[PDB]
């Protein structure tokens, strides 16, 4: 019916003890103007997080799409420009992380396409 056998087997019980740390901190992601940028990070255990920018908190709406799946968080941003660039933080319970997002400029002058 519906059972895709992958082969890779590995069972691990999920406990709810001890503190939570970061396994894959954010990484310097570079995007192009007029494009779509999206960051991703993996945690040690499922938990709430907060995206900060320099010295302010961000929100989820249209231009900014916030999504989370277990221990895999991500933040999509449509309608790039240049201001979006900066220092994206991510505090999870106690620990915290920060990255550097860069926004390039669209292709100008004589170009093929």
By the 10 Å C-beta count (0-12 exposed, 13-18 middle, 19+ buried), 101 is classed as buried
* Locus of tokens 């900066």: 86
Token couple for 67: 């999504």
- Experimental technique used to determine this entry: NMR
CB distance 20 to 45 below 8 Å: yes
Would you list the DSSP string of the chain?
A: -----------------S---EEE-----EE-TTS-EEEEEEESS----EEEESSSB---SSSEEEEEETTEEEEEE-S--STT-EEEEEEETTEEEEEEEEE-PPP-SS---
Strands lying side by side in the sheet with 86-92: 30-31, 95-103, 86-92, 50-53
CATH class of 20-104: mainly beta
């Amino acid at each position: 019916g519906s059972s895709g056998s992958s082969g890779r087997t590995s069972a691990m019980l999920t406990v709810r003890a001890l503190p939570i740390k970061f396994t894959e901190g954010l990484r310097n992601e570079e995007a192009t103007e007029g494009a779509t940028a999206v960051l991703r990070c993996e945690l040690s255990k499922m938990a709430p997080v907060e995206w900060w920018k320099g010295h302010e908190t961000l929100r989820d709406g249209d231009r900014h799409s916030l999504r989370q799946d277990g221990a895999r968080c991500e933040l999509q941003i449509r309608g790039l420009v240049a201001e979006d660039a900066g220092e994206y933080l991510c505090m999870c319970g106690k620990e915290r992380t920060s990255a550097m997002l860069t926004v390039r400029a669209m292709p100008s002058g004589p170009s093929s396409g």
